Amino acid sequence: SGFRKMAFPSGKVEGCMVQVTCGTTTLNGLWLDDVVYCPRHVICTSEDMLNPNYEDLLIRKSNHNFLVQAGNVQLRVIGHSMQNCVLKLKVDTANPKTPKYKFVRIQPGQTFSVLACYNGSPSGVYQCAMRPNFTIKGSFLNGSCGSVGFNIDYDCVSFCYMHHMELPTGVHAGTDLEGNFYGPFVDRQTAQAAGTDTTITVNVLAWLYAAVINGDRWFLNRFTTTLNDFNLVAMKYNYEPLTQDHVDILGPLSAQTGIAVLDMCASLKELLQNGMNGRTILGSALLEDEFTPFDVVRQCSGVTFQ
Amino acid sequence: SGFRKMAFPSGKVEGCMVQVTCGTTTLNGLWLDDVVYCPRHVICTSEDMLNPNYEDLLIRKSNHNFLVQAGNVQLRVIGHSMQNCVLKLKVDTANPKTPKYKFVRIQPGQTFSVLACYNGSPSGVYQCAMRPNFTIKGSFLNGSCGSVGFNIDYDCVSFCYMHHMELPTGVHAGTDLEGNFYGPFVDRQTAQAAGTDTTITVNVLAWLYAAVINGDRWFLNRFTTTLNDFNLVAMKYNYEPLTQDHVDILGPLSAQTGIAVLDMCASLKELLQNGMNGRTILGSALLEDEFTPFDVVRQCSGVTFQ
Numbered sequence: 075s076g077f078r079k080m081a082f083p084s085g086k087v088e089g090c091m092v093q094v095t096c097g098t099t100t101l102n103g104l105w106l107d108d109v110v111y112c113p114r115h116v117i118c119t120s121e122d123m124l125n126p127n128y129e130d131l132l133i134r135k136s137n138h139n140f141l142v143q144a145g146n147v148q149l150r151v152i153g154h155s156m157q158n159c160v161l162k163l164k165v166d167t168a169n170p171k172t173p174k175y176k177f178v179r180i181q182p183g184q185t186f187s188v189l190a191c192y193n194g195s196p197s198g199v200y201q202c203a204m205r206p207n208f209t210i211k212g213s214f215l216n217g218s219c220g221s222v223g224f225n226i227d228y229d230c231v232s233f234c235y236m237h238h239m240e241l242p243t244g245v246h247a248g249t250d251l252e253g254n255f256y257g258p259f260v261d262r263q264t265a266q267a268a269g270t271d272t273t274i275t276v277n278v279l280a281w282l283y284a285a286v287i288n289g290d291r292w293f294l295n296r297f298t299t300t301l302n303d304f305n306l307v308a309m310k311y312n313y314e315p316l317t318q319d320h321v322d323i324l325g326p327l328s329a330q331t332g333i334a335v336l337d338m339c340a341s342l343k344e345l346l347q348n349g350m351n352g353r354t355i356l357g358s359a360l361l362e363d364e365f366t367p368f369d370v371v372r373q374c375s376g377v378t379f380q
Numbered sequence: 381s382g383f384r385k386m387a388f389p390s391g392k393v394e395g396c397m398v399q400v401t402c403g404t405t406t407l408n409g410l411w412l413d414d415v416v417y418c419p420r421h422v423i424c425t426s427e428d429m430l431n432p433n434y435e436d437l438l439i440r441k442s443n444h445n446f447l448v449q450a451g452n453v454q455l456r457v458i459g460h461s462m463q464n465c466v467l468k469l470k471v472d473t474a475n476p477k478t479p480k481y482k483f484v485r486i487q488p489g490q491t492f493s494v495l496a497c498y499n500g501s502p503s504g505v506y507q508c509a510m511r512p513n514f515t516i517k518g519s520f521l522n523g524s525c526g527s528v529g530f531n532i533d534y535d536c537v538s539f540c541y542m543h544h545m546e547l548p549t550g551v552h553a554g555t556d557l558e559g560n561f562y563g564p565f566v567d568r569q570t571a572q573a574a575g576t577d578t579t580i581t582v583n584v585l586a587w588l589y590a591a592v593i594n595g596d597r598w599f600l601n602r603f604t605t606t607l608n609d610f611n612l613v614a615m616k617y618n619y620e621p622l623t624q625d626h627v628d629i630l631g632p633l634s635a636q637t638g639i640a641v642l643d644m645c646a647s648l649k650e651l652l653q654n655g656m657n658g659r660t661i662l663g664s665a666l667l668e669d670e671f672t673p674f675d676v677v678r679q680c681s682g683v684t685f686q
């Protein structure tokens with residue numbers, strides 16, 4: 075028992091990080107087989123970052139202007155191309171540590187682990203959610219770009235995020251690994267507005283199931299509710315609406331704990347209307363919305379990877 | 381910017397996990413060079429776990445009664461010995477992925493990353509603190525024992541914890557890698573009492589420095605205080621006393637942010653006396669005490685490992 079914000083084991087992704095330097099700018103790359111993927115602003119100078127024309131700037135670069143370092147080893151670049159907001163540097167050498175992998179574009183509300191890196195080396199790993207407004211609440215400094223977020227399925231690493239920037243409020247924005255930003259952001263040095271952020275209702279419910287599984291049951295009430303009536307109250311408190319697909323996704327938790335989704339909705343309604351009277355659920359004084367139903371099952375049933 | 385509960389990159393430790401099976405019981409082992417370290421209750425049956433005599437039970441076992449599996453590969457056991465609450469199984473083969481490592485016994489208040497494993501395979505990684513009462517608030521299921529907690533220094537993995545059990549309230553207890561328990565616990569199936577748990581004051585302060593570094597400054601007051609007067613208020617709210625060594629440890633954060641330790645103590649005093657008026661610090665409605673000063677520096681200055 076116990077419930078913690080757990081990240082995926084990071085080893086398979088650690089073996090793929092490289093450093094990419096183009097002139098003065100250095101950031102992280104992802105080396106899979108014989109291609110290094112990295113953010114395109116690596117070709118910028120500080121002056122270029124205000125108003126960059128990336129197509130222009132890449133025209134000036136040769137393969138040899140990209141210094142790619144894997145540990146102490148320089149990888150010879152033999153080609154380069156730009157795909158949306160990422161660069162693909164073809165290199166001499168296939169990464170012998172390449173895991174089975176996929177590139178995925180996640181949906182809002184979905185979680186993933188970030189391996190925060192500087193100079194091609196890992197600093198730490200944490201778990202994040204793609205927020206409804208297509209930001210993530212990360213921890214990233216100068217030099218972190220090209221860090222990636224991922225999920226694992228047994229042996230397959232699904233890469234879903236590459237880091238590109240920080241937005242006025244200390245939240246973060248990035249791309250899938252085809253270079254398309256999540257949300258309406260661009261890789262340009264400006265304060266960019268994020269949409270108002272909402273709470274991920276299906277994840278709050280999943281976490282309430284995690285609480286019940288772990289014996290923290292005080293918040294359960296005797297009432298039930300309809301999906302419609304719950305989603306009204308959800309609107310008022312800036313909670314995403316709960317769809318029938320979400321109800322289906324919560325099915326296995328519901329059957330394991332004996333508590334129908336809609337009865338859990340009743341309890342959450344009360345929590346939103348009445349707050350918590352300075353009680354905690356799973357050690358938290360706030361309702362937590364960065365565990366998906368699958369995250370709850372993984373942790374609470376001991377799903378492993380290798 | 382941003383501040384997250386980050387774990388250490390887990391790869392170096394992932395390469396060391398093995399599965400150890402003795403009859404019906406299976407748990408995790410740590411394979412470093414030609415030795416596998418694992419909890420001694422692996423030699424128990426369910427009946428033995430109530431009242432075990434481990435010396436007796438190990439006498440009955442041959443080297444060949446220990447099935448050690450690294451991935452799909454069975455490692456041949458060529459010797460065994462018991463050191464306090466851990467077994468050391470000497471094996472045929474040195475682990476070629478053994479990192480530079482040390483065994484350390486951490487102090488209460490210190491943090492480390494846990495790599496939660498089942499059947500020798502990783503499930504996830506999270507960060508924990510050794511609580512003042514020598515428990516940790518982990519996430520561990522049946523089969524998790526032999527999972528380890530660690531810190532990294534550049535290239536050196538300091539192993540500090542091996543998991544052995546769960547205590548009545550969903551907290552956890554374990555040993556250093558010489559087999560000595562943290563705290564007064566034993567590896568026996570009984571409800572064991574943990575001391576009352578207290579808050580790690582130096583870590584709360586460090587986290588308040590992390591908040592300031594990240595722009596979340598509302599809680600700072602104009603007052604200062606003396607160490608003595610602060611430690612009185614700390615007693616009342618079940619906070620560990622702050623020593624001069626702790627004040628020294630916070631020195632670098634204090635100099636980076638311009639806020640003397642004792643002035644931060646003044647602000648925390650107010651927080652303890654007045655609570656938070658439903659505000660959050662770094663996204664938390666509670667004062668967080670599982671980041672050490674070093675953890676704050678690592679994250680906020682981008683310290684990496686490889």
Ligand SMILES: CC(C)C[C@H](NC(=O)O[C@@H](C)c1ccccc1)C(=O)N[C@H](CO)C[C@@H]1CCNC1=O
Nearest residue numbers: 115123214215216217218219239240261262264265
């Ligand atoms: C797109 C590219 C041209 C630069 C990008 N710009 C950026 O994020 O500008 C932020 C600071 C900003 C500007 C103006 C107004 C408000 C906010 C950038 O620096 N990305 C780094 C890459 O390593 C990661 C950043 C660094 C700090 N924290 C991160 O996550």
Ligand SMILES: CC(C)C[C@H](NC(=O)O[C@@H](C)c1ccccc1)C(=O)N[C@H](CO)C[C@@H]1CCNC1=O
Nearest residue numbers: 421429520521522523524525545546567568570571
């Ligand atoms: C010492 C050894 C003989 C068994 C040990 N006993 C144990 O923890 O008993 C707990 C359940 C208990 C008993 C009585 C009263 C209150 C609590 C054990 O099972 N350790 C596993 C190992 O994999 C990890 C556990 C499993 C569940 N969560 C964990 O962390």
